[PDB]
Swiss-Prot record, chain A:
Family assignment from sequence similarity: Belongs to the DEAD box helicase family. DEAH subfamily. DDX16/PRP8 sub-subfamily.
Protein name in UniProt: Pre-mRNA-splicing factor ATP-dependent RNA helicase DHX16
E.C. no: 3.6.4.13
Phenotype upon changing H288A: No loss of pre-mRNA splicing activity
Full-length numbering of the shown residues: 162 to 1021 of 1041
Top-rank taxon: Eukaryota
Subcellular location per the Swiss-Prot or TrEMBL entry: Nucleus; Nucleus, Nucleoplasm; Cytoplasm
Gene expressing this chain: DHX16
Motif (DEAH box): 285-288
Swiss-Prot record, chain D:
Organism: Homo sapiens
Region (Disordered): 18-85
Protein name per its UniProtKB record: SNW domain-containing protein 1
Location in chain, cross-link Glycyl lysine isopeptide (Lys-Gly) (interchain with G-Cter in SUMO2): K111
Gene: SNW1
Family statement: Belongs to the SNW family.
Subcellular location: Nucleus
Subunit structure comment from the entry: Identified in the spliceosome C complex. Associates with U4/U6-U5 tri-small nuclear ribonucleoproteins (U4/U6-U5 tri-snRNPs). Component of the minor spliceosome, which splices U12-type introns. Interacts with SKI, SMAD2,SMAD3, RBPJ, RB1, PABPN1, MAGEA1, SIRT1, FOXN3, U2AF2, DAXX and ATP1B4. Interacts with PPIL1. Interacts with VDR and RXRA; preferentially associates with VDR:RXRA heterodimers. Interacts with NCOR2. Interacts with MAML1. Interacts with NOTCH1 NICD; the interaction involves multimerized NOTCH1 NICD. (Microbial infection) Interacts with human papillomavirus type-16 (HPV16) E7 protein.
Known function: Involved in pre-mRNA splicing as component of the spliceosome. As a component of the minor spliceosome, involved in the splicing of U12-type introns in pre-mRNAs. Required for the specific splicing of CDKN1A pre-mRNA; the function probably involves the recruitment of U2AF2 to the mRNA. May recruit PPIL1 to the spliceosome. May be involved in cyclin-D1/CCND1 mRNA stability through the SNARP complex which associates with both the 3'end of the CCND1 gene and its mRNA. Involved in transcriptional regulation.
UniProtKB/Swiss-Prot annotation, chain E:
Tissue: Widely expressed.
Cellular localization per UniProt: Nucleus; Nucleus speckle
Role description: Plays a role in pre-mRNA splicing as core component of precatalytic, catalytic and postcatalytic spliceosomal complexes, both of the predominant U2-type spliceosome and the minor U12-type spliceosome. Functions as a scaffold that mediates the ordered assembly of spliceosomal proteins and snRNAs. Required for the assembly of the U4/U6-U5 tri-snRNP complex, a building block of the spliceosome. Functions as a scaffold that positions spliceosomal U2, U5 and U6 snRNAs at splice sites on pre-mRNA substrates, so that splicing can occur. Interacts with both the 5' and the 3' splice site.
Organism whose genome encodes this protein: Homo sapiens (Human)
Spans through the membrane: none
Taxonomy of the source species: Eukaryota, Metazoa, Chordata, Craniata, Vertebrata
Whole-protein coverage range: 1002 to 1057 of 2335
Disease: Retinitis pigmentosa 13: A retinal dystrophy belonging to the group of pigmentary retinopathies. Retinitis pigmentosa is characterized by retinal pigment deposits visible on fundus examination and primary loss of rod photoreceptor cells followed by secondary loss of cone photoreceptors. Patients typically have night vision blindness and loss of midperipheral visual field. As their condition progresses, they lose their far peripheral visual field and eventually central vision as well.
UniProt domain comment: The MPN (JAB/Mov34) domain mediates interaction with TSSC4 and SNRNP200. Has structural similarity with deubiquitinating enzymes, but lacks the residues that would bind the catalytic metal ion. Contains a region with structural similarity to reverse transcriptase, presenting the classical thumb, fingers and palm architecture, but lacks enzyme activity, since the essential metal-binding residues are not conserved.
Protein name: Pre-mRNA-processing-splicing factor 8
RNA sequence: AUGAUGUCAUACUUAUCCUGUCCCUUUUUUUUCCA
């Protein structure tokens, strides 16, 4: 079917790519001409000996670095236990003392450096987080007055293993999957669905034939956790046989039997191995996740299961989406695992609610004051609401004093500082109660034990993208039925818990949708359209969807990719189209990077690209240090637009030597900075692929603004005397207050985001020239409109 | 010493080791825990400065010698009001000298 | 820089705690202090520009505070320069205390 | 006088600098003695297998590090170093323990940055700091 | 820095004005400046040195 | 001898305002001769 012509085109692409790289290699070896008396040699031979000497010194202490590392690296896992003999013991004291000797022999030089620059130098006329220990000896300075058991480990592992809800269900379901190729495995949390199932399949011999067993997760770090625990059971090194591969992080070697990955990782394994020939089992976890990659892989592996019968497809999930799961996958049997640890007492409010924030407040007030021991988890929508909540709780804390006991209020969302995310993971201090105000991120992949109460406001921030004007609005929306169901299910994991819903049984059973809109519907799909055009699906209409998108959204998608030129006047891939297609980011950015080659602003567009990759969480804006943060941010504000502001901040951070306390001092989230750095170098790792030459704009921000123009020409707005209004649609937008030009208000602006918060907005904007729009897109932007 | 050992024990210093000694010591213990430890760690030479404020403002500061944010609060006169009332006669002996009963207000706990 | 500036501006506000009948000139000073409390980087840019380039200043006023057994001179400087001087003051005392300029016998000290 | 003092400061400085320099050269030559005798004391039943394991692990270590340096210019720096810092990563890897801190009923019972002494004004009623009843 | 030193010493040399009398400070120190604490204590430091001797 | 109608500007009154409009949930993506 379409699968096979797709694969046809794919293998054709792979050979064409190989030949293209080969042609490039020979071309450049052509372009670089390898042109490669007595006292002449007697002169330069000393000098080549000079560089020999010097680069040999660097290389020499480099091999000393090698074995310096290697001594302590090898002696770590051999010496401290085993009954070893004279020779290697002698060598231990040797390497120990001798590396210490080298360390001190360079410490001598360093010491003399610093003590010899310590001194007084007459001036010359020429035209880590402890400021509460810098303020704790100030007081103590002011207040002074002087004048085998590893077998036991494995037995314990297996003993707990025996108490899984899948351990008695072992052999029946193993025979079950031995029968039918397609198996629905419905199971709740804690069942061992993610851990024990691949162990079993290892035990079954599905690994022989050189085969692998894939387990994919919707989240990298969740994959890491699952992998770590399964390797703990496996008693081996995580990474050689039980291994995981996600972005920037390979922890797999050619011993890999159990390979854990994300759904996009498996998609990109479909960039390398279409038939999945070395994997005998693909186990897709919690597919209810409703991910772009989930519903891509579903269709692709459905076609595989049709065309590869001895292949093993196991897709396990938590919730009742098994009806449509089987229906699309032609009525697979549904093996029921019963897993639910402890009973959950769910309460309803007596009537509906009016101001659910104060209801949250007073609910946790009473729960704390009157309940017996046990942690509290409470859901809100997000950051603004969440700090207002903690404000209210800590206000009550202050006012009621020691008539209460210790209420560690702990807010949590995704973009708050990572140390303060880790803050909630400490075991609770005796006597104190631990109350976590959370976003639905703590619905999934955050398992904080001890939670015995949980309260649900029945709401959530759902994205909603109407393409008919291109509106992506993160709006308030009463939460799904399954959503509240597992928001209940988030509790009980260690004891009988409670879940109080802020709404009635009436509103619940009556006014509740089952599952949140399968994202394929709601999301904007540019990257996945470009991706299935990368694999060669010409007819994207009769493609094997589980949930098709509305024809309109794919219409505007195709018109977009045509406009930026990736499609020809009938809608298939240009050479630009495919090369931009391999880049795992939306085509806006990819085409701007295409323009950076033309304008010679390579590195700058690379860095801006890397910046918008994670941007939403760059700058911390605490309430207790508002003005210091605002000012450390206003420091970088450069003229031209906030994109080059991000450029400048990354420039200054890398300037520091990639320091964390740099970003701490300058009020920038280290997480975003670090990930932007690694994503920039990943784009450089693909940089030779897409035929990009490394040149800098030489301080010519005109080139960089024009490359941004060529990339985001669609993303532009113009002045109207009734506000800022779109160029094409002429519907009204507004300036983000956090924008570096928020009050400069340019006549011609370029943007990157499109939301409609409490007012219609666009984020990370820049001032543009309308002439560059005709310079870039005279076929889409004509003069009459500007 | 309780701090060091609470690092050794790595337990948390709880309110019970610090409510016997809450207003004692010269800074004061309740200074360790005020709101602005973070921008007052950078105010140095404040004592000389309040001394020299006498050449800038036309008024005389009777507490030229101290600072409440830095030195704590070195006196508490809240028993003085109570014992002043008990020595004048009590609220009854005090209000028989007043127009209190000619107001017919039922009792003096509501006065404002 | 912002901690040193916050300390300077709080110290300068401490004069008109009363929020009295003050005058035009104190009104103008309070205006400068508030707009520098809102926008702290135009302030600091100005401050360092001053410290770098300025060497001829306006005129000071003098008057005497009568303490009945001697008089005290009281000097009256203009607002823009009062802000630049307050920040310079904080910066110098902070750095001097970190590099240990003043040996332990120079004693209106912050420790007792 | 300022020129004379500048010169005397500079020359006294380099005087003592050089003297301490020679002191460090002495220190490091006795470290040379120490190192030679270290290897000398070095040179003269799990050891055999843990030793084949030494060469085992270190040798495939050099193989993997070689070929890392080879495939990507520094993917030894793309793989080994960046592996060992990020938060949920470390939580997943079971890494243990990756200053004094105390109760928070204590904090923020008090707020402000200015002395309550009014800056020299006296005519306001600040005698007691807790209402009578 | 010579810049701050020049600011501080060029700032003590101003015109002092009472009702209708005006003169110029050229010799002493105006104590109603805000860094006058620093000048007074540093100069007093120099005089502590003259009184004690560098050795003591 | 003062009717309202007013697109009349000014004069005036509330010692009436000048601070009092602003902020995004979740999250994944293959890489290539080192030297």
């Amino acid at each position: 079917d379409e699968w096979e012509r797709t694969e046809r085109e794919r293998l054709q692409d792979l050979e064409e790519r190989d030949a293209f790289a080969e042609r490039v290699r020979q071309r450049d070896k052509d372009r670089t001409r390898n042109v490669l008396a007595e006292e002449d040699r007697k002169a330069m031979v000393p000098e080549l000996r000079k560089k020999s000497r010097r680069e040999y010194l660097a290389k020499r202490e480099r091999e000393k670095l090698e074995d310096l590392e290697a001594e302590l690296a090898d002696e770590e896992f051999l010496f401290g236990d085993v009954e070893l003999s004279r020779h290697e013991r002698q060598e231990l004291k040797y390497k120990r003392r001798v590396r210490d000797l080298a360390r001190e022999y360079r410490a001598a030089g360093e010491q003399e450096k610093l003590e010899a620059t310590n001194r007084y130098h007459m001036p010359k006329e020429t035209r880590p987080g402890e400021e509460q220990r810098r303020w704790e000896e100030a007081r103590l300075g002011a207040a002074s007055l002087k004048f085998s058991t590893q077998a036991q480990q494995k037995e314990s592992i297996q003993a707990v293993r025996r108490s899984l809800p899948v351990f008695p269900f072992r052999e029946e379901l193993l025979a079950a999957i031995a029968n039918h190729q397609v198996l629905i495995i419905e199971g709740e949390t804690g069942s061992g669905k993610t851990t024990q199932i691949p162990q079993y399949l290892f035990e079954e011999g599905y690994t022989n034939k050189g085969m692998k067993i894939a387990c994919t997760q919707p989240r990298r770090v969740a994959a890491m956790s699952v992998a770590a625990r399964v390797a703990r059971e496996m008693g081996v090194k995580l990474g050689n046989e039980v291994g995981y591969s996600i972005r920037f992080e390979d922890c797999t070697s050619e011993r890999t039997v159990l390979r854990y990955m994300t759904d996009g990782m498996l998609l990109r394994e479909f960039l390398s191995e279409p038939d999945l020939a070395s994997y005998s089992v693909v186990m897709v976890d919690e597919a209810h996740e409703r991910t772009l990659h989930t519903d891509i892989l579903f269709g692709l592996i459905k076609d595989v299961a049709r065309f590869r019968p001895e292949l093993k497809v196991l897709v396990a999930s938590a919730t009742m989406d098994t009806a449509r799961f089987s229906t699309f996958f032609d009525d697979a049997p549904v093996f029921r695992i019963p897993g639910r640890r402890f009973p959950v007492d769910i309460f309803y409010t007596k009537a509906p609610e009016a101001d659910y924030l104060e209801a949250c407040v007073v609910s946790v007030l009473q729960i704390h004051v009157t309940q017996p021991p046990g942690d509290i988890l409470v859901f809100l929508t997000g950051q603004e609401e969440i700090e207002a909540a903690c404000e209210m709780l800590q206000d009550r804390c202050r006012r009621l004093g020691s008539k209460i006991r210790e209420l560690l209020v702990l807010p949590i969302y995704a973009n708050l500082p990572s140390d303060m995310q880790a803050r909630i993971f400490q075991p609770t201090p005796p006597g104190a109660r631990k109350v976590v105000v959370a976003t639905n991120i703590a619905e999934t992949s955050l398992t904080i034990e001890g939670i015995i109460y949980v309260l649900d406001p029945g709401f959530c921030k759902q994205k909603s993208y109407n393409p008919r004007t291109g509106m992506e609005s993160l709006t308030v929306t009463p939460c799904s039925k399954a959503s509240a169901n597992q928001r209940a299910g988030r509790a009980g994991r260690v004891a009988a818990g409670k879940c109080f819903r802020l709404y009635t049984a009436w509103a619940y059973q009556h006014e509740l949708e089952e599952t949140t809109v399968p994202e394929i519907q709601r999301t904007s799909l540019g990257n996945v359209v470009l991706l299935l055009k990368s694999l060669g699906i010409h007819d994207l209409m009769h493609f094997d969807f589980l949930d098709p998108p509305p024809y309109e959204t794919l219409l505007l998608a195709l018109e977009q990719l045509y406009a930026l030129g990736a499609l020809n006047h009938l809608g298939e891939l240009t050479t630009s189209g495919r090369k931009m297609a391999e880049l795992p980011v939306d085509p806006m950015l990819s085409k701007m990077i295409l323009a950076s080659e033309k304008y010679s602003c390579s590195e700058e567009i690379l860095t801006v690209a890397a910046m918008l990759s994670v941007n939403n969480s760059i700058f911390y804006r605490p309430k207790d240090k508002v003005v210091h943060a605002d000012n450390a941010r206003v420091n970088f504000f450069l003229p031209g637009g906030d994109h080059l502001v991000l450029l400048n901040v990354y420039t200054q951070w890398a300037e520091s030597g990639y320091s964390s306390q740099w970003c701490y001092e300058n009020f920038v989230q280290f997480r975003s900075m670090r990930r932007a750095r690694d994503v920039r170098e990943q784009l450089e790792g693909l940089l030779e692929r897409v035929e990009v030459g490394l040149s800098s704009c030489q301080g010519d921000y005109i080139r960089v603004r024009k490359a941004i123009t060529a990339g985001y020409f669609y993303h532009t707005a113009r002045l109207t005397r009734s506000g800022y209004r779109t160029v094409k649609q002429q519907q009204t937008v507004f300036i983000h207050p956090n924008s570096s030009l928020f009050e400069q208000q340019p006549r011609w602006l370029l943007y990157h985001e499109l939301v409609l918060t409490t007012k219609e907005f666009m984020r990370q904007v820049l001032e543009i020239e309308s002439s560059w729009l005709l310079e870039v897109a005279p076929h889409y932007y004509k003069a009459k409109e500007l | 010493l309780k701090r060091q050992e609470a690092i050794a024990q790595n337990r948390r210093l709880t309110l019970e080791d610090l409510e016997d000694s809450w207003d004692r010591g010269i800074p004061r213990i309740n200074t360790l825990f005020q709101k602005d430890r973070h921008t007052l760690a950078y105010d140095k030479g404040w004592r000389v400065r309040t001394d020299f404020k006498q050449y800038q403002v036309l008024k005389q500061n009777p507490f030229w010698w101290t600072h409440q944010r830095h030195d704590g609060k070195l006196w508490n006169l809240n028993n003085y009001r109570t014992d002043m009332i008990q020595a004048l006669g009590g609220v009854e002996g005090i209000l028989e000298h007043t127009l209190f009963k000619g107001t017919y207000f039922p009792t003096w706990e509501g006065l404002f | 820089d912002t901690k040193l500036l916050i300390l300077a501006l709080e110290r300068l506000k401490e004069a008109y705690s009363v929020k009295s009948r003050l005058n035009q000139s104190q009104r103008e000073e309070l205006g400068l202090i508030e707009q520098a409390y809102d926008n702290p980087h135009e302030a600091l840019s100005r401050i360092k520009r001053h410290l770098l380039t300025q060497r001829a200043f306006k005129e000071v006023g003098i008057e005497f505070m009568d303490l009945y057994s001697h008089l005290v001179p009281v000097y009256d400087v203009e607002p823009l320069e009062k802000i630049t001087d307050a920040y310079l003051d904080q910066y110098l005392w902070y750095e001097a205390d970190k590099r240990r300029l003043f040996p332990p016998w120079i004693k209106p000290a912050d420790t007792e | 006088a300022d020129r004379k003092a500048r010169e005397a400061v500079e020359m006294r400085a380099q005087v003592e600098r050089k003297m301490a320099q020679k002191e460090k050269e002495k220190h490091e030559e006795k470290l040379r003695e120490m190192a030679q005798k270290a290897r000398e004391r070095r040179a003269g039943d799990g050891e055999a297998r843990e030793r084949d394991e030494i060469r085992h692990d270190r040798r495939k270590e050099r193989q993997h590090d070689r070929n890392l340096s080879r495939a990507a210019p520094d993917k030894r720096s793309k793989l080994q170093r960046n592996e060992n810092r990020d938060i949920s990563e470390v939580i997943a890897l079971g890494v243990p323990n990756p200053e004094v801190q105390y109760d928070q009923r204590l904090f923020n019972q008090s707020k402000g940055m200015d002395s309550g002494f009014a800056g020299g004004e006296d005519e306001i009623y600040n005698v007691y700091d807790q209402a009578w009843r | 820095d010579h810049n701050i030193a020049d600011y501080m010493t060029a700032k003590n040399n101003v015109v002092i004005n009472y009702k209708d009398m005006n003169h110029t400070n050229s010799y002493g120190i105006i104590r109603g400046l805000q860094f006058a604490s620093f000048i007074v204590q540093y100069y007093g430091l120099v005089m502590d040195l003259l009184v004690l001797g560098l050795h003591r």
